[PDB]
Design a protein around this ligand. Sequence first.
Ligand code: BEF
Ligand SMILES: [Mg+2]
Length: 116
Amino acid sequence: KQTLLLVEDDKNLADGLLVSLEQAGYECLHVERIADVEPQWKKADLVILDRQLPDGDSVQHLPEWKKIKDVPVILLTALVTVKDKVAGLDSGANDYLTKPFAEAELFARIRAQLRA
Ligand code: BEF
Ligand SMILES: [Mg+2]
């Protein structure tokens, strides 16, 4: 069994999301602030990361998050500009996928981050 962590302030988006991954045979964590990622970063084998929480930007903490544990990070945010893409990808994100998004593709990019 594999463990992912969902960092998302959008509840209802996280609502229908946290069920498909469970149907994919996972155990997940949900987080809606930046004051809740550090307690759970050491727990998941992959982080699905939303940028603008009510705390601020989550990419600013991403490097200091990444060196606690080299965890694959997938940035799922409504920041679609290429300037935002190069920001997260270089900050330590193994992938970057914008909103709106495909569940079958997000799962494929998760199935691609966990084969090593
Ligand atoms: F509000 Be998130 F970054 F999509
Ligand atoms: Mg958000």
